Symmetry: C2
Subunit: 122 residues, 2 copies
């Protein structure tokens, strides 16, 4: 099942965040941490076709900060649109995922930049 | 230096993909694999202010899959927009990354969905 509960944040066992499936309504897949709107981790995902030869994916993530904001959004917002051409059932496309996870890997440039409130400097 | 070479694809030593900073054209960052246009792994990144109290990140990725298309290609295209408000120097926001990786961690609903050329079903 593609729609199943998963650890979104892995702190190594203690302080893990689990998002559970709460909807699959007319296209949109929705995951949600067991919190109140304001404090909940969110994941939304759709899957459609882009023109003739490709498939499109629209993912959205909302992560709250620990620490004006009754129900107000002191959340970080992410939006991903991955457009991949249709491939034969025998092909291996694990690549894109490993590249995505490679982007946000801790100790990597971009991962490091998001943490310093910094840009990309030489 | 945020503009520093990194491993985007980690295959456990043999067949890793290193991306090197090639430009920083007065804004956008750009990492490329030592390959000809057609076959290279590509990364880009902007960093700008979104209104009064937040900042935005604009990341795009091109994942060539060795799989008509000479210069045109079986490229997987990703595009991330990450809106994050202003946070104190002392603050820990590493949860953003941890979340980003979670989402694309292999063995997870999403990594699993982009493989089978599937959507979110039960």
């Amino acid at each position: 099942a593609t729609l199943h509960s998963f650890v979104l944040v892995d702190n190594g066992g203690t302080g893990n965040v689990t998002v559970v499936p709460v909807s699959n309504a007319n296209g949109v897949a929705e995951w949600l941490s067991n919190n109140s709107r304001s404090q909940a981790y969110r994941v939304t995902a759709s899957y459609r076709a882009s023109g003739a030869d490709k498939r499109k994916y629209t993912i959205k993530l909302e992560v709250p900060k620990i620490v004006e904001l009754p129900v107000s959004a002191w959340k970080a917002y992410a939006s991903i649109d991955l457009t991949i051409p249709i491939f034969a059932a025998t092909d291996d496309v694990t690549v894109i995922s490993k590249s995505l996870t490679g982007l946000f890997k801790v100790g990597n440039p971009i991962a490091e930049a998001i943490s310093s409130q910094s840009g990309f400097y030489a």
